Amino acid sequence: MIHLYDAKSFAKLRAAQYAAFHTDAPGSWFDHTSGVLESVEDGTPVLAIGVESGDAIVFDKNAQRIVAYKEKSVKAEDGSVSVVQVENGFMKQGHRGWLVDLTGELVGCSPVVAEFGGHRYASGMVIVTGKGNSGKTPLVHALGEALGGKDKYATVRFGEPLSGYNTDFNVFVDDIARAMLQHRVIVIDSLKNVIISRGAFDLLSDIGAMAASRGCVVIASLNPTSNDDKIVELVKEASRSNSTSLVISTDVDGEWQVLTRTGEGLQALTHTLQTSYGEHSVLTIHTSQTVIKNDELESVLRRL
Amino acid sequence: MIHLYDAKSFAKLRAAQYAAFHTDAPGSWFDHTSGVLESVEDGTPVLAIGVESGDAIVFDKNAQRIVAYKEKSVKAEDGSVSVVQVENGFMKQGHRGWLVDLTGELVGCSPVVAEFGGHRYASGMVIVTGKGNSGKTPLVHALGEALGGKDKYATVRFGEPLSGYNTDFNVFVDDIARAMLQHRVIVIDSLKNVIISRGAFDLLSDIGAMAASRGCVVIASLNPTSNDDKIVELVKEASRSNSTSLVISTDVDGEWQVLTRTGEGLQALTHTLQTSYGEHSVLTIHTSQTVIKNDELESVLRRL
Amino acid sequence: MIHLYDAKSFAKLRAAQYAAFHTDAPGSWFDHTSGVLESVEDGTPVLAIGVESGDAIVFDKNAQRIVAYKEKSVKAEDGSVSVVQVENGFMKQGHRGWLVDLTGELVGCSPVVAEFGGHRYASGMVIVTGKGNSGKTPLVHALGEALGGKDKYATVRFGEPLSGYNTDFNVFVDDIARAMLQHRVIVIDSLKNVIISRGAFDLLSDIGAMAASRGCVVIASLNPTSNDDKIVELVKEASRSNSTSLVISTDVDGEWQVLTRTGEGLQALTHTLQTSYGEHSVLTIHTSQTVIKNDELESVLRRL
Amino acid sequence: MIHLYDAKSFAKLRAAQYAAFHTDAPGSWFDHTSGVLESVEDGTPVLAIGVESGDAIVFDKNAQRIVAYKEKSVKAEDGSVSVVQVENGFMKQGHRGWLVDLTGELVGCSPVVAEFGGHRYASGMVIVTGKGNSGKTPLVHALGEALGGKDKYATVRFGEPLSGYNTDFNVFVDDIARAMLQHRVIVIDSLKNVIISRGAFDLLSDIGAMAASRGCVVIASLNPTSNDDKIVELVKEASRSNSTSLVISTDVDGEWQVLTRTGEGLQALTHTLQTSYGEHSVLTIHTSQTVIKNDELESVLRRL
Amino acid sequence: MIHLYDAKSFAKLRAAQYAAFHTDAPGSWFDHTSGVLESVEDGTPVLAIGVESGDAIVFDKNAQRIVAYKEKSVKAEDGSVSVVQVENGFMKQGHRGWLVDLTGELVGCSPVVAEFGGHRYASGMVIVTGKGNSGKTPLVHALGEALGGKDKYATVRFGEPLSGYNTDFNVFVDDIARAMLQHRVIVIDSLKNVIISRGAFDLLSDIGAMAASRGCVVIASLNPTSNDDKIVELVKEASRSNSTSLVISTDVDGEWQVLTRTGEGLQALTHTLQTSYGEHSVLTIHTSQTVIKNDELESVLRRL
Amino acid sequence: MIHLYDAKSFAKLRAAQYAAFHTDAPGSWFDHTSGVLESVEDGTPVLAIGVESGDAIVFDKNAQRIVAYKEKSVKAEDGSVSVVQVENGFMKQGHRGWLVDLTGELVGCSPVVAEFGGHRYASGMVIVTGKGNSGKTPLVHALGEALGGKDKYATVRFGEPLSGYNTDFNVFVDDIARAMLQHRVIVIDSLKNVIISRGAFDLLSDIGAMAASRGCVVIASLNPTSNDDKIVELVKEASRSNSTSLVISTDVDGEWQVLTRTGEGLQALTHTLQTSYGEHSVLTIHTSQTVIKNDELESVLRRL
Ligand SMILES: Nc1ncnc2c1ncn2[C@@H]1O[C@H](COP(=O)(O)OP(=O)(O)OP(=O)(O)O)[C@@H](O)[C@H]1O
Ligand SMILES: Nc1ncnc2c1ncn2[C@@H]1O[C@H](COP(=O)(O)OP(=O)(O)OP(=O)(O)O)[C@@H](O)[C@H]1O
Ligand SMILES: Nc1ncnc2c1ncn2[C@@H]1O[C@H](COP(=O)(O)OP(=O)(O)OP(=O)(O)O)[C@@H](O)[C@H]1O
Ligand SMILES: Nc1ncnc2c1ncn2[C@@H]1O[C@H](COP(=O)(O)OP(=O)(O)OP(=O)(O)O)[C@@H](O)[C@H]1O
Ligand SMILES: Nc1ncnc2c1ncn2[C@@H]1O[C@H](COP(=O)(O)OP(=O)(O)OP(=O)(O)O)[C@@H](O)[C@H]1O
Ligand SMILES: Nc1ncnc2c1ncn2[C@@H]1O[C@H](COP(=O)(O)OP(=O)(O)OP(=O)(O)O)[C@@H](O)[C@H]1O
């Protein structure tokens, strides 16, 4: 919904947004939104996501797909009427994203998802990309575990020529829904095949804010190196302004650079990861914050 | 509708158009058009805007979406007839834009929206763009507040990977409608995702004149830096001739250049803004007019 | 319809075509065709024009849109049947353009629309274009007034971010219809937004001949400077062979170059305009004919 | 239909094809096919041509459009069954082109259309093109008259911003049909607007052979000079292998080069035309044959 | 259908494939498959080919088009089932190509079509192409006659601006069907117009194998010289891997280079033709084998 | 379905994945999944694959195409419902790929398909590609036989101008289904024609994982050498990240380089093959492992 501000009320939104990443207990926003999801009546639609055609599929709080739901309309705070309707397994009226209010007035945040190695990590979409000697898949799994902490992490597998991997985009979105509805740390391996149909374009657009609103983190591996300035510059704009955080490999082997976005109109943070392999290619991230200005973000986007 | 002129009648339109920006009380046109909107019978369609498909949705004076409206026709001065009809939640006959006459004979104006720092600001579409060290989002909010003056400003949030942000284009247009129908200062953050479907192309085309007719200002942040001469030159023609004003960052950090268009066939004004940050990234515009000719507008469009 | 010629009958068509521009009373053809329009029975379709989809809308002599019209058939002098039918507000059988014969046997003319500053001006489509320090809008209005002479001129406004401007293409064509049906001098400001859908492509193709057949002049401002060899070369072919006359700005400020096409296979005329501004940006064209060969038309198309 | 040959029967086809251009009385094939058209029962479909959508319209021997025609099937010489059916004004079964056999066994000819200035001219599609100081329209009319001889020539007018010109493609094809059905010499002015929809692409493909089969000549003016290697190389392949003859202007003013194709797999002929203007731009071709090999045809296609 | 191999069974397929071109009596496979076609019950579909839309038309052994055929299913060796159904003149279930088994277990062959000048020629698609002084049409006819031997050859004429030439793609495919069903040597003049719709793309893909399976030869003339790297590289991949043999002209006038493909995974053969013209452009191929490796096939594809 | 991990459970997945390629008996996974297929009730859908339109066709354990199957629903271990439905010969609800669980919890493997010449070969998609003197077809058959070992191999033939070859994409996918359902070693000759419609794009995406999940190997020959950076870079990304293994020819004649992918996030293996020809072009691979890092995979992709 739309929000109204003056100097004073704006000043305290920023104050609150800063707190959401810098001071709030790690993982606490996810906890709060689980409670908001649990207080929804069974059967009520909570999440709608785009399938391959551009049609949307819809889910309840238990990640059950809704097949039929008679028109229901709420009156939001600004007078706006939200209309939800599912017919023959697809959405007939409504919008992609959260069909319930998780954020209320607290919008434009990067709610902290976890602290690891003395670094705070933001929820939203983290894109693991780059070019060269470093391998992305071992990193998403290693980073998934590390941000998992006490919790197990979810692994969505899509579009790779390996056993068990699903290659259907509609099963893929059905996966992501369940994961965001039920888990704080989600790994997508890989995001390559989506990058383009209507529902695929919708995913790139939508998944960052879905995850950021939930307070869960989606860590996706995206591999370019294509060198086609028709597809490599979509794997550069997606990384640019479609992700909340960005993890990109450097010239030094086993070294990665993290660019976290800390909130609406706040200063993007940076830090560097050192990594090594163990038995069966299992990667470990070692333990033992600078502000990064613009034109340095462009200078890092050397993926050609 | 079409308008007929001779030397004399044309001369006084210009006279009136000049007045609309240079001499009229700031914010006074918005006030006049609120009164025209309030004198419309409830239920009567006042605003129609394009959804993602290219179908149009329609609103009343209270920003309520119309679901069914029997065919009504109105005769003009003039000859021309206007036909309005809403069926099953969508427009069946009519046009995108204002379904009521706000402007009458006073057309081609940039009605002054506010005075700030001794500078008059035009209503219509202001696009905040550029390339480099300067951040757009803190500016649209700072400029929104400043033009707000005594009034709060509206913030439409679209297409960013942050908590609370809506990613559905149809919810987005439903936002803009409400904002223009109810508020003098509107902020859109961000315009990036719209830049392309039919309804998206329609928004760029339509929103400038909708806002200028209302006497409200829509301040949108648009970020290029893509360096793809397929998308960066649509973020150059939209900025060029789809906006009423333009705010673009310079080489000097915290400095911005404002190019106001003062009305149909009148001289575009220019001036420079100095800015600094405070607590939690809250931006302030400092306080303490040259005419800019063509080829200097092209010379400023160095976004490659 | 098709026309048959021999040496003798062809020779006198040229004789007549030359007369239509060089010797006939200025504005006299427009007068003749108003009489032909007034001698049409009420309700009978006279003009059909393409809407955005490519469907056509149809008008009577009074610029009233026709909603239902039962199939009527007219036989021509060459044994060809013209079929006209309107159903549910759209054309079901027929053709875009004049649904009545205005020209008879007198075809391929540039009927003189007005004399001003000792120069004859042709009816049809005049495109006001160019690149640099000179402003198009003040010129189309100045030139509109001047060719208006004793008469007021019509001003169609489309696709600019200013108060009152219509941004709907279907309202736009409804404007043009009325204007051509009722006025000798028409101004379109601006043609930029049309330049592409089916109905838009149809307008560029159709409007030149519609206006030339009526003997009314459509003066449209088209602004390129885009520097994209995908859109700037459509604002070069439209100017090239889609307009009857062309008015383009030069290196000298306030100076414009007029290239009139005088008729089917006749010599295109050229001349130069001097202009200055007065109060409130109101432009004046000063008072006090060379034949221009090919390759000099290409040499003038330096809009890159 | 398919044709079967051996050395002997092939040798006499070539013998006959050569005769069709080099020795047969000029215009005699057109006369023969008029007789074949006159011996068709009224109402029977003789010609089908593509409209804008790709649907086909159909005509009888008198150039009357057929609206309803019940399925009729003939058995051709090779066993093949030709099926013709018109329903609600459009073809339902059949093919574009001549729905009756005009050629029988005499196929692959360029039947001589006229002799003028001691030069034989072939029927089919003649494309008048080029770049520079020379004007195409005066030439198509001059060449139309000259090949007309004792007969008047037909003038189809399409897609120019002049009075009387039709801009609807469907009226355009309805013109061409009538002209080919009723006249030996046809002029199309101009072919520019067709060069692209389905029905337009169909015209370029189909009209050469339609005219060649009839023994009538279609002289079309096509103007490039666009310098866009997306449209200028379609105005180079159409000229190349979509026309029977080609008339192109040279560096010398008023001089044109004719490249006639004399028949299936025979030697293309060349010759040069000198021209001058008279009163009202009426062009005259002066009076007082070399074989042109390949790579010299490419060397002449200097339209960039 | 799928085929299963081991070392031994594979070794004897190659043995048989080699024999099919190198040792079998020229023209003997065509004879065998005529017998297989003659032992099909009347009415039973034998050949299905793609029309312009991508729908398929179907034929019986006598080249009669089938209009209605009730669903018939046949069991294979093998497991696999083949379903054939024709409804309202089009295929409703099935596949493009031979609806009966001509090849059985003998697949991947280039069955010898004829011996001429002491050279064996393969059946399948022969593409006659090149750039320069040499003419393609006289060659396809000369080569058609030579491979015809004791038999007449079929001539399909498509897409040229000459008398009798068909320009409708659907009549074109109806021709090819008949020709392949009834004749060993077929000539297509020309293949230029097909090179693109769905049915056209289908022809290039399908006709090589249709002809190779039948043991008939389709000799098609394809002319590029366009110099557009959007169309000239489709007249380079079609020639490359869409034809069984390739006949291309050299720098020396009247000399052509033949590249025969001798069978699945066997060595492509090469040889050179000398030619001269006689009366009425009738070409003769003179009388009085090297293996060509890869990179020499690319080195010959100099058509730019 | 989605999978949940911690440090410990992830560590043993890698342990298991490594085992699946490095230590498990060659061909043993294929054996296991045949048992899982045999324990499915007759009629139950097991495999769904995309036809040309993007619709899916469905098969039972015996490779019989399913025509009608009433909606059946199965619950997973993670609370997700799989819905399968076939109506009028096409899938109405479900997903492309295996409609039964073959992999359970053992996902992201490259199950070893065979050992040959002391080298383990992975199942999945092997693409045989390259540029130059070496021939692909003899290799896919040689490699097919060698990995076949004690078993015969299946040969799917598609899109080549040779006798017996199928050119219909729908018959093609029907082949692949049967082959994967019934055989451990499959050869596709060739993949060229698929490389683009919806169903074709789906095959590239889907076939790698289908085969890897089955534990069968699909060896496909793909030939580029096109030198068009619109099609050659799709024959570079398909080879890159759409195949499990890659076999590419080198500068030395008869020598090939094998790049095996050993499993999800494990080290890709490399080795070199020496080959020679025998009688009738039958190729033999000679008998008498290094880890290949990134940037060396790019350095090998020199196919321009
Ligand atoms: N134990 C190890 N020691 C050294 N290098 C390793 C080890 N395990 C994996 N690698 C390297 O890291 C990469 C991991 O495989 P993977 O294919 O997932 O990398 P990636 O960069 O994510 O590419 P993709 O997009 O194809 O998944 C391999 O290319 C491999 O060379
Ligand atoms: N207090 C501050 N002092 C200096 N620089 C700041 C401060 N706060 C923010 N910035 C800079 O201004 C930018 C504001 O954030 P933001 O990313 O919203 O800008 P933006 O141009 O809108 O980019 P985006 O489109 O990614 O949101 C940051 O990139 C940051 O580097
Ligand atoms: N009195 C004046 N003196 C000098 N220059 C003027 C004067 N009035 C207007 N101009 C110039 O002419 C232009 C008129 O404005 P306008 O926006 O109509 O031009 P335009 O070329 O039609 O642009 P657009 O195509 O966006 O409408 C302005 O750019 C202005 O710089
Ligand atoms: N009497 C004449 N004397 C000298 N030149 C003439 C005469 N009449 C016409 N021309 C020239 O020949 C051309 C004829 O006009 P026209 O526009 O038909 O030429 P074109 O080359 O066919 O171009 P288009 O494609 O626009 O028709 C004009 O450009 C004109 O300059
Ligand atoms: N008797 C002959 N002597 C020398 N050259 C000849 C003779 N007959 C024909 N030619 C040449 O061979 C070509 C044969 O004509 P044709 O145009 O059919 O060849 P083509 O390559 O098929 O071209 P197109 O595709 O235009 O038909 C001619 O261009 C001609 O120059
Ligand atoms: N005995 C042999 N000695 C040398 N070279 C051979 C031998 N047999 C085959 N070749 C070469 O290998 C290739 C095998 O033919 P084939 O057409 O199957 O190759 P390909 O690369 O698969 O081409 P395509 O992709 O068109 O099928 C031939 O080009 C041939 O030159």
DSSP, residue by residue, C83-108: EEEEETTEEEES-SEESS-SSTT--S
Answer yes or no: do D153 and C108 touch at CB < 8 A. no
Judging contact as 3 or more Cβ pairs under 8 Å, the answer for D and A is no
Q: Which helix (H) or strand (E) holds D166?
A: none
- Tokens at E62, concatenated: 């006598």
Q: Which atom of ligand 2 is found nearest the CA of B190? A: 25
In angstroms, the Cα distances linking D204 to C60, D95, E87, E170, E230 are 36, 16, 33, 17, 20
Residue of chain E whose Cα is closest to the Cα of D237: E226
Q: Buried (b) or exposed (e) across B101-116, using 16+ Cβ within 10 A?
A: ebbeebbbbbbbbbeb
E221 lines ligand 5 (CB under 6 A): yes
- Taking CA atoms only, the protein residue closest to ligand 4 atom 8 is D281
Give how far A277 is from chain F: nearest CA, Å. 11
- Tokens at A187, concatenated: 């790994």
Task: Collect all residues of chain B within an 8 Å Cβ-Cβ radius of residue A5.
Answer: 141, 144-145, 148, 152-153, 155
Of D276, D277, D280, D282, the residue with max ligand 4 atoms within 8 A of its CB, to mutate for a pocket test, comes to D277
Answer yes or no: do B164 and A81 touch at CB < 8 A. no
Task: Collect all residues of chain C within an 8 Å Cβ-Cβ radius of residue D168.
Answer: 95-97, 206
> What is the distance between the alpha carbons of residues E220 and E189, in angstroms, rounded to a whole number?
6
- Tokens at C57, concatenated: 């809308």
The segment(s) of chain F belonging to CATH 3.40.50.300 are: 6-41+104-304
E155 contacts E149 by C-beta, under 8 angstroms: no
**C-alpha closest to that of A107 among D44, B160, F210, B209:** B160
> What is the distance between the alpha carbons of residues A115 and D288, in angstroms, rounded to a whole number?
96
Answer yes or no: do D14 and E281 touch at CB < 8 A. yes
D193 lines ligand 4 (CB under 6 A): no
Q: Which residues pair with D263 in a beta bridge?
A: D109
> What is the distance between the alpha carbons of residues D234 and D219, in angstroms, rounded to a whole number?
18
End-to-end CA distance of chain C: 40
Structure method: X-ray
- Interface size between A and F, measured as CB pairs under 8 A: 157
F136 lines ligand 6 (CB under 6 A): yes
Out of D165, D178, D281, name the one closest to residue C107 (CB).
Answer: D165
Q: Which ligand is nearest to the CA of F191?
A: 6
DSSP 3-state of F38: helix
Q: Which atom of ligand 2 is found nearest the CA of A241? A: 26
| Largest Cα–Cα separation, chain C | 59
E241 lines ligand 6 (CB under 6 A): yes
CATH 2.30.270.20 at D42-103, yes or no: yes
Pocket around ligand 3: residues whose beta carbon is below 6 Å from it? B 241, 265-268, 293-294; C 135-138, 160, 190, 192, 221, 223, 277, 281
Of A17, A22, A127, A266, the residue with max ligand 2 atoms within 8 A of its CB, to mutate for a pocket test, comes to A266
Q: How many beta carbons lie within 10 A of that of residue D15, not counting itself? A: 13
Q: Which atom of ligand 5 is found nearest the CA of D291? A: 31
* Omega cis (within 30) before A190: yes
Q: Which residues pair with F56 in a beta bridge?
A: F50
Angle between helices D169-182 and D198-214 (to 10 degrees): 10
Question: Residues near F216 by Cβ (< 8 Å), separated by ≥ 6?
Answer: F30, F113, F123, F179, F180, F183, F184, F185, F186
Out of E65, E162, E179, name the one closest to residue D244 (CB).
Answer: E162
D271 contacts D284 by C-beta, under 8 angstroms: no
Question: Residues near E213 by Cβ (< 8 Å), separated by ≥ 6?
Answer: E33, E97, E98, E102, E103, F163, F164, F165
Answer yes or no: do B79 and C178 touch at CB < 8 A. yes
For residue D131, the CA-to-ligand 2 centroid distance in Å is 55
CATH 3.40.50.300 at D6-41+104-304, yes or no: yes
DSSP label at D183? -
Answer yes or no: do C124 and D162 touch at CB < 8 A. yes
Answer yes or no: do C108 and D183 touch at CB < 8 A. no
> What is the distance between the alpha carbons of residues A123 and C163, in angstroms, rounded to a whole number?
43
**Do the bridges between strand D283-285 and strand D269-277 make them parallel or antiparallel, or are there none, so unpaired?**
antiparallel
Question: Helix H segments across chain C?
Answer: 7-22, 28-38, 136-148, 169-182, 198-214, 237-241, 296-300
Question: Residues near B33 by Cβ (< 8 Å), separated by ≥ 6?
Answer: B102, B213, B214, B215
Answer yes or no: do E261 and F162 touch at CB < 8 A. yes
- Interface size between A and B, measured as CB pairs under 8 A: 160
> What is the distance between the alpha carbons of residues C267 and D135, in angstroms, rounded to a whole number?
10
Out of A161, A183, A231, name the one closest to residue F125 (CB).
Answer: A161
The segment(s) of chain F belonging to CATH 2.30.270.20 are: 42-103
For residue B195, the CA-to-ligand 3 centroid distance in Å is 27
Out of E133, E163, E175, name the one closest to residue D106 (CB).
Answer: E163
F298 lines ligand 1 (CB under 6 A): no
Question: Residues near A23 by Cβ (< 8 Å), separated by ≥ 6?
Answer: none
In angstroms, the Cα distances linking F32 to A119, A166, F3, F38, F151 are 46, 20, 22, 10, 16
Question: Residues near B22 by Cβ (< 8 Å), separated by ≥ 6?
Answer: B112, B120, B262
F221 lines ligand 6 (CB under 6 A): yes
D268 lines ligand 5 (CB under 6 A): yes
> What is the distance between the alpha carbons of residues E231 and F228, in angstroms, rounded to a whole number?
11
> What is the distance between the alpha carbons of residues B182 and A3, in angstroms, rounded to a whole number?
12
**Do the bridges between strand C217-221 and strand C124-129 make them parallel or antiparallel, or are there none, so unpaired?**
parallel
E277 lines ligand 5 (CB under 6 A): yes
Answer yes or no: do A205 and B227 touch at CB < 8 A. no
Q: Which helix (H) or strand (E) holds C1?
A: none
Q: What is the DSSP string of E12-25?
A: HHHHHHHHHHHTSP
Using a 10 angstrom Cβ sphere, with 0-12 exposed, 13-18 middle and 19 or more buried, the burial of residue E97 is buried
Task: Collect all residues of chain B within an 8 Å Cβ-Cβ radius of residue C194.
Answer: none
B250 contacts B257 by C-beta, under 8 angstroms: yes
> What is the distance between the alpha carbons of residues A203 and A173, in angstroms, rounded to a whole number?
8
Chain E interface, mutation test: which of D85, D103, D219, D264, most E Cβ atoms within 10 Å? D264
The helix/strand count (H/E) of chain F reads as 7, 18
Out of F157, F161, F179, name the one closest to residue E107 (CB).
Answer: F157
Resolution reached, in Å? Answer: 3.0
Q: How many CA atoms lie within 13 A of C152 on its CB side?
A: 13
Task: Collect all residues of chain B within an 8 Å Cβ-Cβ radius of residue C228.
Answer: 229, 233, 237
Task: Collect all residues of chain F within an 8 Å Cβ-Cβ radius of residue A168.
Answer: 95-97, 206
Q: Which residue has the tokens 């104050």?
A: A15
